[PDB]
Design a protein around this nucleic acid. Structure first.
Ligand SMILES: [Cl-]
Ligand SMILES: [Cl-]
Ligand SMILES: [Mg+2]
Ligand SMILES: [Mg+2]
Ligand SMILES: [Mg+2]
Ligand SMILES: [Mg+2]
Ligand SMILES: [Mg+2]
Ligand SMILES: [Mg+2]
Ligand SMILES: [Mg+2]
Ligand SMILES: [Mg+2]
Ligand SMILES: [Mg+2]
Ligand code: NA
Ligand code: NA
Ligand code: NA
Ligand code: NA
Ligand code: NA
Ligand code: NA
Lengths: 95, 156, 140, 186, 154
RNA sequence: CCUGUCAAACUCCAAACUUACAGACGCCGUUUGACGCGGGGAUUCCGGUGCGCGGGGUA
RNA sequence: AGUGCAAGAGCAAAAGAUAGCUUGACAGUGUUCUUCCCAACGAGGAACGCUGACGCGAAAGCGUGGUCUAGCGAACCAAUU
RNA sequence: UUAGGCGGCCACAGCGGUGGGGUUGCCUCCCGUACCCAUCCCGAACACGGAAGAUAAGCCCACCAGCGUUCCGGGGAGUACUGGAGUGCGCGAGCCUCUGGGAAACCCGGUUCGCCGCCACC
């Protein structure tokens, strides 16, 4: 990389297809999850807040409590255990 | 400089003029020759087909084209036929002209990438294939071996 | 069908595009209600570089206030045809514009379930000339 | 519309019916919404919750079914709104609903408006709702006093036939009074 | 059910390919295993496709090899009809063979090593540089094709 | 309208493939204790070649 | 289009424009990610909380500076609260 | 749902167009400014009060495919590209065979002029 900021090489993953452009539906921004639930992590390009480090896009973690309205999701980066602070807007129930 | 230096398509496509400056002008004079006022309304249509993917410098294009069209004056300056070179030299080419230090070369020319089996030239003639000869002379000045192909023409 | 298809006058905008005013005064008397400042956009050579800046006034008149005005404005104008909108509008003159439309216009001016007026229910230049011409004067 | 790249708004945005930016802020509370809506002739009040396939209305009241309790006056006014709010609020209570947030859709937060009247009624029915007392009308106007006095400047009945000539804010009381005890569907 | 025989060594073969052979109980050249034809097992054999020989054997062939190269989970014991009878659900090798082919059981379930340690092919095989369709010995084989191999390595 | 062409820093499209999690089979672990946790001791931080994909360079 | 400035990304009853009001560019203390993929490492940065005090709004709510990724600095010593 | 309200998916729903519907009821347009409230100027809008009129807008209902979109058949194409293997070919660039996957453009023909949820309601 020529630089090492969080958005380095995120041109594709943080950009919306022209038709999904614009404000996202609120339904999934208010979804509620329960501790133990498996959720897929994926940043919604339209939603500024409640994001996580782009490196985690594509992870499927386990909700384990929350902080404020954001959720605390446990994942495993490679072999390391990490806890991600993320809002519903960027989460989806597995299966 | 020899074609040996640029005839291969082993480098990335390098054509973005928004990031490349100082590109030499093309030496290719025209792409449409003969009676360009008329449309392909001819009985015979021969084509020169490249038999290997290669890069053809605008140098060879101009020499190949001239040698063919200049000869197509076996039909006359205002003869009845139309000649087309369908490719354009989009690939910008460099030269590292310090040794291997900071070697990104500087723009020295342009070339056209042709894939094996494409037709680079297309002529349109009435049963009067002097064009078949204009081409024996054209593939004489381009790197690849070539196939002279006749399409609309069962007048053998 | 008709009655709800027949034209009517919706607002008549009388504005004086000055270049920097004292002019409001006359607009107030020529119409009958306060004028409104006219700020300008973009910086330009006519020493008009100021973005927010009084450069004229306008007055939007509705209902009687608009008729009682046109009942003297029109007479001071001759023109017609070509000088008409594709929507049945026309501006003459100090400018005096007349916006014309049919009964269900509020549908495109309200907040809730607003909608754009169908081309068919729109007012044509011709259908406009008729209405007005049919009101104290002549066309072309 | 124009091409593959064209962006078409969400349906309820095209229809100019739902303000999604306000919707989101509303859903933040996690509380049921007190949907206050109006019509040229009527006033509706719904207690909506969120659902898997769309909103769920757990209780509602329409100004029309107000006559079903003794209403003999117009239904597009302040007294009408309040009562509809109270009726919906009561039905709400019956349904196990305790609190809600005032969703006024695309209407304006004007002081003394009907949507606020609806809100005042729902609150009096027992519903706990985030509100602000001095943005509501002054009771009398809710009763319909502004209209009675308006008819004082009579010369011609404000009501074409309808009921009464000088109108009745008293009819309002009788009704509110009614709603506050027993009766069916409450 | 297919018969798997490793014909190419471990040296230089991808590790994920090697681990696959190992999950299919083959750890040496010429070792053979019998694998059910399932979606899961199919993927595995396709991956191993280039270092192995496989196909569905005939009842007879399986029986010849079973008798000749089958072994107990532990020990030298010969797996003959009597062994089969006194140790398995079947009454003889043919019974077992049929059960295997019809994928009703497995060499393990019957207390037998999952591996038939074959002998080099008498007369040699067709080469490990080309597949069957090219005259070589790698890849999927005809029932007649597999049989030849298995029998030459009996 | 017709007609001739392109893109490492274009994309209306779009693989093979790589990858998160889960189940299934396989293999493995429960006297050969896996997975994991804590601690002692290192060596190592000139690498090279083949194949596939590369970027630079006439090479 | 605009959104202070590279480039890429976000944004339309707004994240843009106009107007009005306001000082949350607030104090205290954390959780987490990043800095340093995996995998230890400081300053710095960010996300998300809480406690306290406030601003605006009818209210849900928004405000932990600027729509996001650059704009930064140890120990010793000094001055300051 | 003989016209309503709140939505979910967010073009299969867009763009454009045709036909039908209101006798009491609905939504509207509509009529009107004493009030609550309102326009940097206008009861245009916002807000309030109301039915003389109308179905012409909107809206609801039925339908049309020209454009845009979604999915499918047949063709393009098992082509392009590609994971694994090869003492196969080629001066080389590169190609070929086996094995496991497999496209885009475009043409022709269908589909699509929204679907679904909650509530209310001759
Ligand atoms: Cl993170
Ligand atoms: Cl409403
Ligand atoms: Mg990329
Ligand atoms: Mg043994
Ligand atoms: Mg021998
Ligand atoms: Mg051999
Ligand atoms: Mg990759
Ligand atoms: Mg911010
Ligand atoms: Mg020092
Ligand atoms: Mg100091
Ligand atoms: Mg009609
Ligand atoms: Na979006
Ligand atoms: Na130098
Ligand atoms: Na040649
Ligand atoms: Na830190
Ligand atoms: Na001003
Ligand atoms: Na209508």
């Amino acid at each position: 990389p020529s630089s090492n900021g969080p958005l380095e090489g995120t041109r594709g993953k943080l950009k919306n297809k022209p038709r999904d452009r614009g404000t996202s539906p609120p339904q999934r921004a208010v979804e509620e999850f329960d501790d133990g639930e498996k959720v897929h992590l994926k940043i919604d390009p339209s939603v500024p807040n409640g994001r996580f480090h782009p490196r985690f896009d594509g992870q499927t973690g386990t909700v384990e409590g929350k902080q404020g309205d954001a959720y605390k999701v446990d994942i495993v980066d490679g072999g390391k255990e990490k806890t991600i602070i993320v809002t519903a807007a960027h989460l989806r129930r597995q299966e | 400089k020899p074609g040996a230096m640029y005839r291969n398509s082993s480098k990335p496509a390098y054509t973005r003029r928004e990031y490349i400056s100082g590109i030499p002008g093309k030496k290719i004079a025209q792409f449409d020759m003969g009676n360009n006022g008329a449309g392909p309304t001819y009985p015979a249509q021969v084509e020169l087909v490249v038999e290997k993917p290669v890069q053809i410098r605008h140098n060879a294009l101009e020499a190949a084209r001239v040698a063919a069209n200049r000869y197509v004056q076996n039909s006359g300056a205002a003869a009845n036929y139309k000649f087309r070179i369908r490719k354009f030299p989009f690939h910008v080419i460099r030269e590292n002209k310090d040794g291997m230090r900071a070697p990104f070369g500087k723009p020295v020319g342009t070339a056209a990438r042709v894939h094996g089996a494409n037709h680079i030239f297309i002529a349109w003639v009435n049963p009067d294939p002097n064009v078949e000869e204009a081409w024996r002379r054209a593939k004489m000045k381009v790197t690849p071996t070539i196939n002279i192909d006749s399409s609309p023409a069962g007048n053998a | 069908f008709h009655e709800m298809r027949e034209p009517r006058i919706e607002k008549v905008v009388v504005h004086m595009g000055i270049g920097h005013a004292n002019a409001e005064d006359i607009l107030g008397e020529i119409t009958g209600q306060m004028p409104v400042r006219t700020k300008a956009k973009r910086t330009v050579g006519e020493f008009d570089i100021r973005e927010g800046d009084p450069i004229g006034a306008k007055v939007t008149l509705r209902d009687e206030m608009a008729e009682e005005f046109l009942q003297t404005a029109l007479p001071l104008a001759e023109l017609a045809t070509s000088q008409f909108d594709d929507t049945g509008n026309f501006s003459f003159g100090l400018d005096v514009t007349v916006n014309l439309v049919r009964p269900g216009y509020r549908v495109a001016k309200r907040d809730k379930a607003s909608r754009s007026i169908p081309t068919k229910h729109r007012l044509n230049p011709a259908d406009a000339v008729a209405f007005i011409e049919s009101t104290y004067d002549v066309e072309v | 519309a124009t091409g593959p790249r064209y962006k078409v708004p969400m349906r309820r945005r095209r229809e100019a019916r739902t303000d999604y930016h306000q919707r989101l802020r509303l859903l933040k509370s996690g509380k049921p919404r007190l949907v206050a809506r109006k019509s040229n002739k009527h006033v509706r009040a719904q207690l909506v919750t969120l659902g898997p396939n769309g909103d769920d209305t757990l209780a509602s009241a329409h100004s029309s079914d107000l006559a079903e309790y003794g209403w003999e006056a117009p239904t597009g006014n302040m007294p009408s709104a309040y009562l509809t709010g109270l009726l919906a609020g009561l039905r709400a209570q019956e349904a196990g609903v305790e609190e809600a947030v005032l969703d006024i859709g695309l209407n304006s937060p004007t002081p003394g408006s009907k949507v606020f009247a609806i809100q005042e009624g729902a609150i009096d029915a027992g519903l706990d709702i985030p509100h602000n007392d001095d943005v509501l009308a002054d009771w009398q106007r809710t009763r319909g006093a502004h209209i009675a006095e308006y008819d004082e400047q009579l010369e011609e009945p404000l009501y074409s036939g309808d009921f009464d000539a000088a109108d009745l804010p008293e009819h309002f009381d009788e009704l509110r009074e009614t709603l506050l005890d027993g009766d069916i569907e409450l | 059910m297919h018969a798997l025989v490793q014909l190419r060594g471990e040296v230089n073969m991808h590790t994920d390919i090697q681990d696959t052979l190992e999950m299919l109980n083959i750890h040496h050249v010429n070792h053979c295993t019998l694998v059910p034809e399932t979606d899961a097992y199919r993927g595995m054999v396709a991956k191993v496709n280039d270092f192995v020989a496989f196909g569905e054997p005939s009842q007879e062939t399986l029986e010849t090899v079973l008798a000749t190269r089958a072994e107990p989970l532990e020990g030298d014991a010969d797996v003959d009809d009597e062994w089969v009878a006194e140790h398995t659900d079947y009454d003889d090798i043919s019974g077992l063979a049929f059960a295997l082919l019809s994928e009703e059981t497995t060499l393990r379930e019957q207390g037998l090593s999952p591996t038939l340690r074959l002998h080099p092919p008498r007369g040699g095989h067709d080469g490990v540089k080309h597949p069957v369709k090219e005259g070589g010995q790698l890849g999927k084989h005809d029932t007649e094709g597999i049989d030849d191999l298995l029998e030459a390595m009996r």
